[PDB]
Curated annotation (Swiss-Prot):
Residues 37-105 form the KH type-2 domain. Part of the 30S ribosomal subunit. Forms a tight complex with proteins S10 and S14. It comes from Bacillus subtilis (strain 168). PANTHER family: 30S/40S RIBOSOMAL PROTEIN S3, SMALL RIBOSOMAL SUBUNIT PROTEIN US3C. This is Small ribosomal subunit protein uS3. Belongs to the universal ribosomal protein uS3 family. GO terms for molecular function: mRNA binding; rRNA binding; structural constituent of ribosome. SUPFAM superfamilies: Prokaryotic type KH domain (KH-domain type II) (SSF54814), Ribosomal protein S3 C-terminal domain (SSF54821). GO terms for biological process: translation. Pfam families: KH_2, Ribosomal_S3_C. It comes from the Bacteria.
Length: 210
RNA sequence: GCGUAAAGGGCUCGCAGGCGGUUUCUUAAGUCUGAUGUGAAAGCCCCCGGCUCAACCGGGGAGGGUCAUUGGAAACUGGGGAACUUGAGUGCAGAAGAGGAGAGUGGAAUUCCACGUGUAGCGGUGAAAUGCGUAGAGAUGUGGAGGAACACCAGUGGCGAAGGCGACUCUCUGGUCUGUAACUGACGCUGAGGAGCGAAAGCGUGGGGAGCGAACAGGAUUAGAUACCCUGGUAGUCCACGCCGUAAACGAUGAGUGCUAAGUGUUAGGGGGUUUCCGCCCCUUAGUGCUGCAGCUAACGCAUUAAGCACUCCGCCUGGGGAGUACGGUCGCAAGACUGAAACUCAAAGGAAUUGACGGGGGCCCGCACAAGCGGUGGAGCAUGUGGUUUAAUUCGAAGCAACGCGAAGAACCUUACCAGGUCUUGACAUCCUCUGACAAUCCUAGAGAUAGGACGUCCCCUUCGGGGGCAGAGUGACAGGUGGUGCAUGGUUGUCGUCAGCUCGUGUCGUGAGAUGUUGGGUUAAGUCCCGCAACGAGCGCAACCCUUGAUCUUAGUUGCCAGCAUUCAGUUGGGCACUCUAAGGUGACUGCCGGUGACAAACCGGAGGAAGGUGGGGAUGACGUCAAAUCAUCAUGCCCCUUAUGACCUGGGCUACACACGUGCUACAAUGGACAGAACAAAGGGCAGCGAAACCGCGAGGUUAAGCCAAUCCCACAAAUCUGUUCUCAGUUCGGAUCGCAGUCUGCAACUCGACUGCGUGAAGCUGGAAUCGCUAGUAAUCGCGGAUCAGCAUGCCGCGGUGAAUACGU
């Protein structure tokens, strides 16, 4: 029985360590600090869809370089909400963290925003074939080597085993030098927690040196 | 409609009946048409009118007959007469056969008998036994008797209506086909009843009984053997005379006739092309076998021997069970045969084809699977988990591998859910409304404690008063809670099948379809790996590689690490040095690269050099769609149900550790390759600031004291142990082994009695290599000797890594 973290399988060999920091006589305040800031943007992203939240430890000041799909949706009205939740995070963890911003375009190349946004886009009464084919057409048509999205579990109520992993194109699932983006989310409708998991293997980088 | 679904009669001969070659004259009996009669009304239909329309009524029509009487046509069926010849028959000449009936004869072989020869077994089987044999068997030699069947020719050969028919000869007899073509002139085809034949089993009588052989006897195999097997053995098989009249009586296909692609056999003939011959070849019949066009079909398949295409006639079929049963008849000596229902009940039986599964079916292959060796387990004491029994509770979860040294990477209290007791009910944790306050702390008492009372105590960062702001308290319900139930509501996650090599799709084609094809065939690999053919062409996940580690180096770079080359000591320790070792970055290096071949050239495969390393170098990470409603609501989250002044919350003590018993995985032993000591030598890896702890002294001892140093390639943990050199134990429950249990200490903690370990003295169970059975293992492997670490105050015989000693075997499927 196998299944593997694609996002942890390729991490550190071709993928990047999403949490950077020095370490450290006290790794505990770093670990819980990064989890708590990950839930800080996690709570502050009910409608922004920040597809990654990198925080950097910088000698008594965090550099929480929060990425975002749309810039001004979390970037505030020209500096209002970003300074507000930023300073509020400064009095939320204890370190005055000058949180930067990021503009993630190409939503078919963003894993958690496109898949999780497909899931909440399914939570509004959207069907399994309509949600999966619709995400395969928007993000599946957006440009990538292959995106395969499936919403596995409760959908339709009874006889709960439902695995429609509808997705096409090539997939470096076992190609260890592929560097695919593959993260899932969890939608919680009225029938039950019937979440979705999809990855979009955009393309590998050829190894070289000089 | 009838080859396989229900349905071809077992087969023939025939009366009645049903159907019938071509020409020609008549006939109207059918066939068809015209005229009259009659088929009443009401009704159906068409066309109008009347009740406001409609239903309805009325009027006007139509249509309805093997209908009569009667007039025509003569094409077709028929009546009658004349004809003709291929149909069918006779003739003439050929050919052929296990066609039949009766009689006679012949061998090969078995049994039995008589006698010679000879000894101790013969026989049978999977292995044996029953049985036979010293009373002379088997075998072998000779001779005799009797029955039954005829080997070789012999063959999807021949003949027959079918069942069937085989040594050879004779009598009597039927039939088939060929050939011209003398005659006859449709004299034919089918045919319900009726008649007749019909394997083998049976049935009656009388013969015959050599082999075979139900029932029966014995022995074997099995838990059982009224069976399979073996040794015997009655009826029967054989004959003649009579009855039986069933079969998968099969080609599961009734008979007759006409037509419709082809090839290739094979008998029985004929004509012929040259051929004395012979022989080849064509044409031709008749019969029979294969391969196939059209066509048929549900598919398999049939296909000039149709299941095609049409005609004649007979028989059979109307879902399955009930049930070919009952009842009634006919026949039978019987056994039974023919004929042959029903009540109830069910929505399926059934035919073909596909996908998968199965197989104690076959084929090919692989893997510690088996074989080959090593070392174990199951035997002993102990450690842990499970079952069970107990309990107030022995918390919940896992139950074939995949449950059992599992969650547990740590149970004295906490853990903890479970028990007993004392408590509180917006509550231990959170948001919200109001409301006061900065909150709280610090001691005392009572209590084992949670708590309850005091005294001591607290009494803001920002406005210009309204504040803002957490904190705490209260009300106050919205709420909060559940390690409750549902892993068959779930997400997430994880095992195994398994690193085994598969698992699918787009397009195309086939096939009415499901499906298939690719993916199969040929090799080759560990591989659906690669190559080549292929009605397929492509791609996806898998395989591989990419990643890390591991043995070879280069280059960079030398500090705490390394010390050659110099001085230096107890000490790389210290001026010195960066050669070597080592450290982590970039690379390089191995990819069938190269050579000899093998091989359908290709794929791969055998062998060799060279190199540190050779045919995926060694190892790790990586686990395909799917299976198991497999594991988890108790890591977490989550649909529903249920509890809530208690299934919630707080505290003390207990339990999770109990114990007639069975297991599961490991430890330590049973011992001389050993046991005790003395001395010496060899590692690698990781951790260490809430920490490691040097040296010094103290204590046998476990450890205590203080304290340099180390935020660590420097210092500490640290000394490795198995191993080597001497003393000695000497075969025994012991100078082996070690529990149990007692006294006596240390360390950890709020506290070691349930329940931490270690040490001292004493004690010295059981064990002398462990049953049926079962396990892991392909070389730095098994096995074995030690070290470090996660949990963690303490708590390892587990778990995860680390190094040391260093094997045997793989014949083969």
């Amino acid at each position: 029985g196998q299944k593997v973290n694609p996002v942890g399988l390729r991490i550190g060999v071709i993928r990047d360590w999403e949490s950077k920091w020095y370490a450290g006589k006290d790794y505990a305040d770093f670990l819980h600090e990064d989890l708590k800031i990950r839930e800080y943007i996690s709570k502050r992203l009910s409608d922004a869809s920040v597809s990654k939240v990198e925080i950097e430890r910088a000698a008594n000041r965090v550099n929480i370089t929060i990425h975002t799909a749309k810039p001004g949706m979390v970037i505030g009205k020209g500096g209002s909400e970003v300074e507000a939740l930023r300073k509020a995070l400064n009095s939320l963890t204890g370190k005055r963290v000058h949180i930067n911003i990021l503009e993630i375009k190409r939503a078919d190349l963003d894993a958690q925003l496109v898949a999780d946004n497909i899931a909440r886009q399914l939570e509004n009464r959207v069907s399994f074939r309509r949600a999966q084919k619709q995400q395969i057409q928007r993000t599946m048509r957006a440009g990538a080597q292959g995106v395969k999205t499936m919403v596995s579990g409760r959908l339709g109520g009874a006889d709960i085993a439902r695995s429609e992993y509808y997705s096409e194109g090539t997939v470096p699932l076992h190609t260890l030098r592929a560097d695919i983006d593959y993260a899932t989310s969890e939608a919680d409708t009225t029938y039950g927690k019937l979440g979705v998991k999809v990855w979009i293997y955009r393309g590998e980088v050829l190894p070289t040196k000089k």
